[PDB]
Design a protein around this ligand. Sequence first.
Ligand SMILES: C[As](C)(=O)[O-]
Ligand SMILES: C[As](C)(=O)[O-]
Ligand code: NA
Ligand SMILES: [Zn+2]
Ligand SMILES: [Zn+2]
Lengths: 154, 153
Amino acid sequence: GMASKWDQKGMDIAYEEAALGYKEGGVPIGGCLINNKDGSVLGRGHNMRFQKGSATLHGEISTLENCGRLEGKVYKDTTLYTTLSPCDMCTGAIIMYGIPRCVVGENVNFKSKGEKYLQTRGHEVVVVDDERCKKIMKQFIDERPQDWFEDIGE
Amino acid sequence: MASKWDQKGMDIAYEEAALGYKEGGVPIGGCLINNKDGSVLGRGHNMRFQKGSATLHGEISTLENCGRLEGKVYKDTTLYTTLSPCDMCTGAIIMYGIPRCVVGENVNFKSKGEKYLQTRGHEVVVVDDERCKKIMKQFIDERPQDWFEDIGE
Ligand SMILES: C[As](C)(=O)[O-]
Ligand SMILES: C[As](C)(=O)[O-]
Ligand code: NA
Ligand SMILES: [Zn+2]
Ligand SMILES: [Zn+2]
């Protein structure tokens, strides 16, 4: 519901992180975590597979790592913004921490069963169809498909 | 045939949990074995306290310690974990297509993940290992607030 007032701020930060990751030579997937009560940014991140040799730092995981350790209650009134619809692992992180809302840049270049699983587990998912996100991810997939396939375990 | 490596995998996972306990962290350990030849691709434990990490659960730390791998490697692996996986760690198993998860115990913790893995075609074996139950219960007795932080409670 009413946390959607933060969604342009959150998606703009997530897209800035994706574009920074793209410039660094990584997968252009970015995220951020916003406190719904006052719009504060708890953290922001992007995929660090190529930057750090990481098998786990998807953009959403890197976002949560960059927030640092938090008391469980903090997550219960946040929104996680991601430029791309989440894989099952990133979905599971949202569910484990009880983050109530996930706002997704696009789900055209990639969608797992996680998007719907978030909804059936009681989380809100909003897909904003941001063409900046679609274009940068399609450019990556077109130019480096085998690096994309590595990021999703294919 | 992959069950032939389960004593090796759970012994490594327990060793990793005991090392994490000694380091002052959450005593949850793991390892990933190549079912084809028994080789240890990686081993790890929870690094929440050691690294100030909100994401390095034992199973995530194990996958990070394997390094980057071709997707095809994961398809004939077993992930060993001393404790039944949360929804995030369940989701990592699904995303990488790891076919088997061998779990030390599900008495101190179980998520909807255990069943969800099976719904989605992954084998789950719960060995009910007393060493794993004892170390996790000791930690929860001493530091329940730190355990709760690890599962977003
Ligand atoms: C959208 As993804 C590959 O960071 O789970
Ligand atoms: C069993 As767990 C807290 O590492 O998902
Ligand atoms: Na899909
Ligand atoms: Zn992911
Ligand atoms: Zn976990």
